[PDB]
Design a protein around this ligand. Structure first.
Ligand SMILES: OC[C@@H]1O[C@@H](OC[C@@H]2O[C@@H](OC[C@@H]3O[C@@H](OC[C@@H]4O[C@@H](OC[C@@H]5O[C@@H](O)[C@H](O)[C@H]5O)[C@H](O)[C@H]4O)[C@H](O)[C@H]3O)[C@H](O)[C@H]2O)[C@H](O)[C@H]1O
Ligand SMILES: [Ca+2]
Length: 315
């Protein structure tokens, strides 16, 4: 359905989603090129996994063997190589991979962009090119420049949403030829718990049947079995909002309908992505494995939509 997140002839609803293989993942996204599937997720130099069928996964290296020097202009206290929360989209033959450079609990952060002609390392044209910073935050800003997501609207215009804590979820128009915001582009805040510490993060926007759906993660990641992350959603007819949940509550005031808050087995599901193929759709996220000391684990499940258009997972 979605040209910039294409999955080909796959039908997500008629597939076994009992995942196997190397499933350690935190903040995943997924892309498909030809018959090959790829996961990008948080880790050293942006970790990659690949699959033939979307179900059996195996590790596939990383994007950056060495971090670009320019990171230190934005995040000088960072002294490890872990890059956070990548986002992948495909436009006019180029793969655009956004990602976050940050340190935990601070908003000295920057979102970068890498591009490639192909996702397939066997291709002679495979090369992740460092296309530099996209947007950043300093301790003087009231937002945190991590957790990117790109969506192209109805008119074909690209937009970037991002954010984690501080004032919450931000939105800014991208220019098509740069895939970066204009220097004077307005930064809009589109979702917030409305109170401290403002535990909202990991935005992902999709368009379906005349509405934009803003998926976010509430509460606290990164605590293993003690994590409290949950996936929430609201919607808006216009991409700039207002985003409102099932109950009429604005997502700027803590609104958000809970899609998954986990259970005793899979704790703290969160940092999600939503993809379509034909009439089918999937939710992708990580969750913390209660039987493997909280190890973050890739989840992929079919995502359904009810008569009013709201998403739901099956039992
Ligand atoms: O390898 C596993 C994990 O991957 C990496 O993290 C991935 C990122 O995790 C998510 O963001 C995490 C983190 O949350 C926020 O920090 C914690 C809070 O910061 C402080 O509050 C900040 C503001 O200050 C006040 O103005 C106001 O109260 C607050 O809004 C407070 O101490 C904490 O509550 C921060 O935004 C971010 O660092 C993302 O989804 C993903 O990118 C890690 O390496 C590892 O854990
Ligand atoms: Ca994300």
């Amino acid at each position: 359905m979605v040209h910039f997140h294409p999955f080909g002839g796959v039908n997500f609803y008629e597939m076994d989603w009992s995942l196997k293989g190397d499933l350690w993942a935190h903040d995943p996204v997924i892309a498909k090129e030809g018959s090959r599937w790829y996961v990008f997720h948080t880790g050293s130099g942006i970790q990659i996994k690949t699959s033939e069928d979307g179900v059996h996964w195996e590790n596939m290296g990383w994007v950056f063997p060495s971090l670009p020097d320019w990171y230190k202009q934005y995040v000088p206290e960072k002294d490890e190589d872990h890059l956070w929360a990548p986002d992948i989209c495909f436009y006019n033959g180029i793969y655009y991979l956004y990602y976050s450079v940050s340190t935990f609990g601070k908003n000295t952060s920057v979102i970068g962009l890498a591009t490639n002609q192909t996702l397939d390392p066997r291709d002679p044209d495979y090369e992740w090119k460092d296309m530099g910073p996209v947007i950043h935050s300093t301790a003087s800003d009231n937002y945190n420049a991590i957790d990117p997501n790109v969506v192209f609207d109805q008119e074909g215009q690209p937009w970037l949403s991002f954010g984690s804590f501080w004032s919450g979820i931000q939105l800014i128009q991208l220019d098509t030829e740069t895939m970066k915001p204009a220097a004077q582009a307005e930064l809009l805040t589109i979702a917030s718990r409305g109170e401290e510490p403002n535990a909202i993060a990991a935005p992902f926007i999709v368009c379906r049947n005349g509405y934009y759906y803003l998926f976010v993660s509430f509460d606290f990641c990164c605590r293993g079995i003690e994590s409290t992350y949950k996936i929430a959603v609201g919607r808006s007819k216009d991409i700039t909002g207002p985003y409102v949940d099932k109950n009429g509550v604005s997502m700027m005031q803590g609104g958000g309908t809970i899609l998954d808050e986990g259970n005793d087995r899979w704790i703290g599901p969160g940092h999600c992505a939503v993809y379509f193929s034909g009439v089918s759709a999937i939710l992708v996220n990580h969750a913390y494995d209660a039987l493997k000391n909280g190890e973050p684990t890739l989840q992929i499940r079919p995502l359904y939509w009810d008569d009013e258009g709201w998403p739901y997972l099956s039992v």
